[PDB]
Design a protein around this nucleic acid. Structure first.
Ligand code: MG
Ligand code: ZN
Ligand code: ZN
Ligand code: ZN
Lengths: 171, 112, 557, 107, 84, 97, 268, 178
DNA sequence: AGTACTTGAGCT
RNA sequence: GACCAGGAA
DNA sequence: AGCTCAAGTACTTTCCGGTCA
């Protein structure tokens, strides 16, 4: 998981920036546009690596307006979860339906029904919890989940998880 | 080759009979164009316009719909190297002024 | 303007022509396309979920599109589809369809010949797609049987098998929109002796084309991805959206639908007759009645000027306007809408010549100077001069018409309450008037020369004629016996550059047409320059002094 | 190279490509009476070696598609015994440059 | 895929069209309040500013010349001769 | 006024490429469409505002480009599609030469 | 038809002339690489004349008391007499001009001497004279080497193609062949010193101007000669009115590549 | 406009099939083992176990702040506070995913110290296991190789219960403390 | 407006 | 707006 | 019946009053 990935990004620049702080404003606009981005294709583009060697290349003057398009070649750390991947995470929310678990940038939600049967919902607890013969699961606790499937919304991926199978659960 | 020769010769004579002078290069080009193919290629609907230039291009002279119909049925792929294609597409053509690209050089932009 | 889109802006690199597989048409379709009625939710003015917009494009000009949400200027069309009750020939490929049947076995779908014949394997190797199809066709048209066993290519005593099927191949002739066959037969090995005579149905030809092998059809002009032969036959009919066939709606209580909307209506109707006719008690000929009829409309919708007689005509007599007809040029989409256009920022009027203009300028009537605009960007260089013109106004001469704010929104100095207290900001645009020494394109048609359109310096002047230097008269072919001339005005900094640097009158003087100058001294000035320079001709001091001063360069000596 | 008076029967005509790699050319005697290559209008054609050709193509960055073409049956092509793919270099006099290089490839 | 500068073969002079596009492009850019690399010595017309940038070879642009085959030579407007 | 076929030639003669485009686009017809990067047609339902795109049936919610062509061509292409011919439009090449 | 048939032809950045298919039409544009505008009729002296007076005009014999440059012509005159080594130079110089004379007579069979070439040399030398107030008396300060090798050099600077390889290099030679003839015929030693009467500095200038003007005279990659050529032929076809069919309908006949022409005719 | 890669794949019309991603080690196209860097040369897939990851972002974010000052001239919970400031100096703040991440990474790393990670990296990258597995093994703490091969099903026959149980033991040694 | 190609049909 | 018809440098 | 042709077809510029849903 948690890959480093070679990527590129076309960026147009208004002529008014064709001054010597050019590569400067470029590398920036890259980090604006790309860093913190999340795409289905590559996942969460987390941190742009190696600022000092970003590839500016030569930029082409577009022909009707005078802006110049650069393909900025770069590389960065990304995070793209998968089905069947096992993740360690922290509980964030908890409800009569299940619990959400924070795994880096993304949340994995575990259904009431994707747990063991004995683990059950305690509405009357602060903060609201899931209790077992021997386990307690609530907002601060740490969980180990099997990612059962992922869904890619706009600037996020969410995913449904399970702790029913072996060696998964509280830790 | 000798065909080309005679071909020019006769074309030159049409122009020069009327008295006018046209520079060699222009007649040469036309004449050369008819010729390079392998023999005499008519400057007509079913002559030059049947070569393997762009579908869209050829379609802009004489056989328009008939051409595009064929273009689809044989899955022609238009290069878009032609003038006319770009004219149809609203793109600047590779024509004079468009025959080449223009880049900023960040380097020299900092040197000055 | 037209609105901002986050989508990446590119240029077309390749155009890849192909054929619609039905599946694709069903797939792009934002609606079928079920009812011949245009709209009128039963008389109630508003579109019917059935023809134009059951999600398609939009009418109304208020009231935005119901798929994208965007309204006329922005929303292109959106395609619909009608499911055809029976397969039908695309009129354009009846041609090719026939020739393919002539090439392949009309029963099994094997190519009639292969690498077992030699001329065949030689045509097969022809690099050019189109040419090879022709080379193949002439070979295969003769072969009148799907042969099972072939003399091998080592010795013709032991006959190697190729593909199955014995079946004789029909001889095929077109009977306008119908393809009909004629099989040799046998009967005591005679025949014919009156051969078998039936008509090839779409559906069968279709099935044969389907069975045609990927490698086989690929040897014919085709492409397994972008155009399979089966797709020369129509089962799913893409329905173009209103912007292609817009209802030109005079006043309000009167539609005025487009010719195509009608032809589709017909197709729709013709399709419903056929559909219910077979789903019901099918009198098996009244079926092939409506079959033919559908095939006809779907034919004449694409092409109505067909060789085989009748011309699908509007009630009135006026024949219907086929899509084909819209395209065949000199007027007509390709030639007259694309290779040429009517254009903005242009003007024309009577010309007359001027002995007092300089060669490369053109006298522009103040009236036109005041109409014609140049989009100038607010900049520190021009900011005051620009503000001056704006305050100056649009009815005044050297003035301006519109101010365009950063927010892409347009200010009309003709009306805008703030047309006085209008305060320019760097980066806005003032569309100002055409002013002295703006480079412009002057052009006298017909335009057979480079030199027939040349860049000139503007000189705004009175009276209503374009005035031009007498010596530039000849490369335009112009005489003042009433001939008008067009003037176009560039809008970009880039384009004026192009004009002044490439096609300015002075540049065009010596010309590659004939390696000589293409304009010179003419008329009065010529007639006079002779008289002037005789030996006889002398000039007194009084006059000489004027003649000298008149030369605008003169060292004053 | 068979030089025949009147005709060669289509029977015999079949035996012509029948012994590769050897190539066989038929020429009508009556044609060969005047040498067309000596005509005023008929400039120097020169057969290029494979090596020679590869270089032409390289130095002009060309696919064979892009080269001007001589038909295989072309009178001069026949004289030189051009086989398809072979390229000839044509040297002509120029009223513009004096001498001029040109190439045609065989169809 | 671009030819190395030491193997360039095109004219080392600048072509009518190259120049017209260079002048036009800069003038556009100047018009759009881009940085000017010259003393506008009372200049105010983006073309004339550009004609002046060109006259002093301080235009930070590059012509990319394409060959029929697709390859190319990049030339600095610095290094192009302007006897044009 | 008509910037006709011949007026075109004359500019091509001049090699005045941009001015040609200006006259053919900004001085007239010019228009913007969104196209799919898979199938090459104007299919895309650009809800450009909620910033959503999609060429359903290509299922492509992601690979979308915008282009500036003359409406007449936009028409011409719809007209061809209407007549079962697909003039697919592509923003990258493959062939070279 | 003409325009539509040639529209996509243009000169590319390698001087090649191609269409949208990148097929070669001319290898060098107009067989000569020159832009049509930069060209004027110009008389190739060398081609005509009696062999008698050709010689009188061009031959220098430093080995012969009557055919030397009289020392009035240049300062070296008195000491140049009998100089064998120099004579080898003039002997190339002359042997070349003669070569050229035969060559030109192979090209222009009729003897026609005027032909449109780039760089009007006549005017250049005129300017040289009026620019440098050349004294149609006092002797030049040129050497035989100055003149002979100056021209030999200037020739190598008339560039039309550029590549570093034999095909391209040869192509360049071809392209330049005719102009070079013109050049050598106008700048032969005797001619320079006796007729034009140039001083060293004048000649130097004349050479430099020639080179420049020549360089000016090549076509600019991008030039759309397709439409240019068509238009250049079609437009004069607009101003149009043994008896062989001629004018407009013969032109029609030709472009059509008509099988059945009106006035077929052999000319034996 | 958005982000592209180096996988030049030209999907001409043929939409589908989009093979599902599982740890049957069928990750994306964008993540097969044969990758290609901007020298065009084929390079192998890069995966990080957190810590290997934490150290990459930390490092890059650091040498980024170094440039932010250059150009301007003319205990885990205790690292959390440290890191939180580094984001405030190099990160555009809106990027709350990085902050969310550096939290998690800081609190879930198995190897706090540089060398220690290199040691892990050595140990695993020698099993020839697919980079994904090699990552997950550095990321997920395990004992019974039953445990291991259950959470990382993709392993299985790839390496013996014993060998993998050896490795696993070595990992728990390097398991840096807090 | 005359030539193009291509269709068509009639005759031996 | 189709379409038809007539008349101009 | 097929196969030859002559005789059949459609197709090859810029401006500025009527009838048709
Ligand atoms: Mg007139
Ligand atoms: Zn819509
Ligand atoms: Zn069969
Ligand atoms: Zn699509």
């Amino acid at each position: 998981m948690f890959f480093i990935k070679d990527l590129s990004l076309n960026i147009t620049l208004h002529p008014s920036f064709f001054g010597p702080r050019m590569k400067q404003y470029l590398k920036t606009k890259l980090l604006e546009e790309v860093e913190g981005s999340c795409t289905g294709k590559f996942g969460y583009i987390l941190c742009v690596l190696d600022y000092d060697n970003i590839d500016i290349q030569r930029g082409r003057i577009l022909p009707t307006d005078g802006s110049a398009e650069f393909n900025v070649k770069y590389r960065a750390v990304v995070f793209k979860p998968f089905k069947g991947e096992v993740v360690d995470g922290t509980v964030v929310s908890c409800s009569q339906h299940g619990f959400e678990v924070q795994v880096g940038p993304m949340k994995v939600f575990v259904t009431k029904h994707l747990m063991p049967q004995d683990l059950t919902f305690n509405a009357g607890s602060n903060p609201p919890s899931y209790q077992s013969s021997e386990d307690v699961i609530t907002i601060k606790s740490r969980i180990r989940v099997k990612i059962e499937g992922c869904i890619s919304q706009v600037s996020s991926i969410h995913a449904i998880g399970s702790i029913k199978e072996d060696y998964l659960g509280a830790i | 080759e000798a065909g080309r020769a005679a071909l020019y010769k006769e074309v030159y004579n049409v122009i020069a009979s009327d008295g006018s002078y046209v520079n060699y290069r222009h007649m040469a080009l036309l004449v050369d164009v008819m010729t390079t193919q392998g023999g005499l290629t008519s400057v007509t609907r079913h002559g030059f316009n049947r070569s393997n230039t762009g579908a869209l291009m050829r379609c802009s002279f004489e056989e328009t719909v008939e051409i595009l119909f064929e273009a689809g049925a044989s899955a022609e792929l238009d290069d878009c190297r032609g003038v006319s294609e770009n004219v149809i597409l609203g793109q600047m053509a590779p024509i004079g002024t468009g025959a080449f690209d223009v880049m900023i050089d960040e380097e020299s932009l900092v040197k000055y | 303007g037209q609105q901002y889109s986050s989508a990446p802006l590119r240029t077309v690199k390749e155009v890849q022509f192909g054929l619609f597989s039905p599946e694709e048409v069903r797939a792009i379709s934002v609606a079928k396309i079920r009812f011949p009625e245009t709209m009128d939710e039963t008389q109630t003015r508003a579109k019917i979920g059935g023809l134009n917009d059951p999600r398609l494009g939009s009418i109304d000009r208020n009231l935005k599109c119901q798929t994208c949400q965007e309204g006329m200027n922005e929303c292109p069309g959106h395609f619909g589809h009608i499911d055809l009750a029976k397969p039908v020939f695309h009129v354009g490929f009846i041609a090719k369809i026939k020739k393919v049947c002539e090439c392949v076995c009309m029963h099994c779908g094997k190519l009639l010949l292969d690498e077992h014949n030699e001329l065949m394997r030689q045509a097969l190797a022809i690099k050019d797609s189109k040419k090879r199809f022709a080379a193949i066709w002439t070979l295969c048209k003769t072969k009148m049987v799907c042969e099972t066993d072939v003399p091998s290519e080592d010795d013709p005593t032991q006959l190697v098998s190729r593909g199955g099927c014995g079946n004789t191949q029909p001889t095929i002739r077109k009977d306008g929109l119908k393809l009909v066959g004629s099989w040799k037969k046998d009967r005591a090995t005679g025949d014919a002796d009156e051969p078998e005579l039936r008509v090839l149905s779409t559906e069968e030809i279709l099935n044969i084309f389907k069975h045609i092998s990927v490698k086989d059809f690929t040897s014919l002009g085709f492409n397994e991805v972008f155009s399979r032969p089966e797709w020369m036959i129509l089962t799913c009919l893409p329905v173009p959206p209103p912007p292609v066939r817009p209802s030109i709606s005079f006043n309000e209580s009167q539609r005025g639908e487009d010719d195509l909307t009608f032809k589709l209506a017909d197709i729709l109707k013709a399709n419903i007759s056929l559909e219910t006719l077979e789903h019901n008690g099918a009198p098996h000929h009244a079926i092939e009645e409506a079959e033919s009829l559908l095939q006809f409309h779907v034919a004449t919708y694409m092409d109505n000027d067909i060789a085989g007689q009748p011309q699908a005509l509007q009630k009135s007599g006026r024949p219907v306007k086929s899509i084909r007809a819209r395209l065949k040029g000199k007027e007509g989409r390709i030639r007259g809408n694309l290779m040429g256009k009517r254009v903005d920022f242009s003007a024309r009027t009577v010309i007359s010549g001027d002995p007092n203009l300089e060669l490369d300028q053109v006298g522009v009537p103040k009236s036109i100077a005041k109409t014609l605009t140049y989009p100038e960007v607010v900049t520190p260089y021009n900011i005051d001069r620009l503000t001056q013109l704006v305050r100056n106004g649009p009815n005044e001469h050297p003035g301006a018409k519109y101010v365009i704010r950063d927010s892409g929104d347009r200010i009309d100095l003709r009306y805008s309450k703030r047309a006085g207290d209008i305060q320019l900001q760097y980066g806005w645009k003032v569309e100002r008037h055409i002013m002295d020494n703006d480079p412009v394109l002057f052009n006298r048609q017909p335009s057979l020369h480079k030199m027939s359109m040349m860049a000139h310096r503007v000189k705004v002047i009175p009276y209503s004629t374009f005035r031009l230097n007498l010596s530039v008269t000849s490369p335009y072919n112009a005489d003042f016996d009433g001939d008008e001339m067009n003037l176009h005005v560039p809008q970009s900094e880039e384009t004026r550059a192009e004009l002044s640097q490439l096609c300015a009158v002075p540049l065009q003087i010596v010309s590659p047409q004939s390696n000589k100058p293409c304009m010179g001294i003419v008329q009065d000035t010529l007639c006079g320059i002779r008289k002037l320079t005789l030996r006889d001709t002398f000039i007194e001091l009084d006059q000489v002094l004027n003649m000298l001063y008149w030369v605008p360069d003169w060292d004053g000596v | 190279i068979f030089v025949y008076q009147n005709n060669i029967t289509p029977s015999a005509m079949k035996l012509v490509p029948s012994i590769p790699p050897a190539t066989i050319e038929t020429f009508n005697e009556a044609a060969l009476v005047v040498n067309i290559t000596h005509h005023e209008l008929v400039p120097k054609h020169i057969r290029l070696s494979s090596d020679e050709k590869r270089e032409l193509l390289k130095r002009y960055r060309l696919k064979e598609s892009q080269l001007p073409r001589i038909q295989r049956a072309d009178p001069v092509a026949l004289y030189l015994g051009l086989k398809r793919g072979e390229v000839v270099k044509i040297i002509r006099k120029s009223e513009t440059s004096g001498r001029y290089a040109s190439y045609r490839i065989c169809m | 895929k671009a030819i190395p500068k030491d193997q360039r073969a095109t004219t080392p002079y600048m072509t009518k069209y190259e120049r017209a596009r260079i002048l036009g492009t800069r003038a556009l850019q100047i018009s759009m309040n881009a940085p000017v690399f010259v003393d506008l010595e009372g200049e105010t017309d983006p073309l004339r500013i550009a004609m002046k940038e060109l006259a002093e070879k301080k235009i930070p642009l590059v012509i990319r010349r394409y060959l029929p085959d697709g390859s190319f030579e990049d030339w600095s407007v610095e290094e192009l001769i302007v006897d044009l | 006024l008509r910037f006709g076929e011949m007026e075109r030639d004359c500019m091509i003669a001049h090699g005045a490429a941009s001015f040609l485009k200006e006259r053919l686009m900004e001085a007239s017809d010019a228009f913007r469409v969104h196209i799919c990067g898979i199938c090459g047609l104007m299919t895309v339902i650009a809800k450009l505002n909620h910033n959503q795109f999609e060429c359903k049936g290509c299922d492509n919610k992601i690979d979308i480009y915008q282009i500036h062509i003359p409406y007449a061509a936009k028409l011409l292409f719809q007209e061809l599609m209407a007549m079962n011919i697909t003039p697919r439009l592509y923003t990258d090449r493959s062939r070279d030469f | 038809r003409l325009v539509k048939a040639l529209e996509d032809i243009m000169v590319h950045y390698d001087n090649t002339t191609r269409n949208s298919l990148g097929n070669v039409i001319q290898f060098i544009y107009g067989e000569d690489g020159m832009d049509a505008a930069h060209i004027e009729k110009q008389s190739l002296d060398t081609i005509g004349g009696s062999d008698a007076a050709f010689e009188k005009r061009y031959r220098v014999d430093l080995l012969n008391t009557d055919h030397t440059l009289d020392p009035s012509l240049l300062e070296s005159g008195s000491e140049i007499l009998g100089d064998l080594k120099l004579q080898v130079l003039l002997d190339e110089e002359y042997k070349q001009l003669v070569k050229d004379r035969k060559f030109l007579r192979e090209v222009f069979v009729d003897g026609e001497a005027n032909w449109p070439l780039p760089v009007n040399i006549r005017r250049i030398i005129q300017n040289a004279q009026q620019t440098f107030h050349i004294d149609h008396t006092k002797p030049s300060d040129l050497t035989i080497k100055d003149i002979v090798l100056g021209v030999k050099d200037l020739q190598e600077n008339l560039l039309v193609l550029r590549g570093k390889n034999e095909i391209i290099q040869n192509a360049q030679r071809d392209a330049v062949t005719l102009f070079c003839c013109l050049l050598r015929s106008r700048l032969a030693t005797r001619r320079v010193l006796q007729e034009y009467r140039l001083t060293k500095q004048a000649f130097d200038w004349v050479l430099s101007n020639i080179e420049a003007q020549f360089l000016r005279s090549v076509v600019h990659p991008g030039e759309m000669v397709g439409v240019l050529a068509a238009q250049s032929i079609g437009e004069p076809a607009t101003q149009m009115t043994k008896k062989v069919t001629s004018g407009v309908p013969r032109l029609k006949e030709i472009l059509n590549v008509a099988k059945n022409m009106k006035t077929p005719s052999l000319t034996v | 406009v958005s982000t592209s890669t180096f996988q030049t794949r030209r999907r001409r019309l043929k939409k589908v099939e989009e093979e599902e991603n599982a740890a049957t080690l069928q990750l994306g196209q964008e993540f097969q083992l044969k990758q290609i860097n901007h020298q065009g040369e084929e390079e192998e897939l890069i995966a990080l176990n957190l810590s290997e990851a934490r150290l990459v972002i930390k490092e890059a974010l650091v040498e980024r702040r170094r440039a932010f000052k250059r150009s301007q001239k003319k205990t885990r919970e205790k690292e959390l506070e440290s890191i939180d400031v580094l984001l405030e100096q190099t990160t555009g703040g809106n990027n709350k995913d990085l902050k969310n991440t550096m939290q998690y990474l800081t609190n879930f790393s198995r190897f706090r110290d540089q060398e220690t990670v290199g040691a892990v990296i050595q140990l695993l990258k020698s099993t020839g296991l697919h980079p994904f597995e090699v990552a997950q093994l550095g990321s997920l703490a395990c004992d019974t190789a039953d445990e291991a091969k259950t959470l990382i099903p993709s392993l299985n026959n790839k390496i013996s219960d014993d060998e993998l149980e050896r490795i696993l033991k070595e990992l728990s040694n390097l398991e840096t403390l807090y």
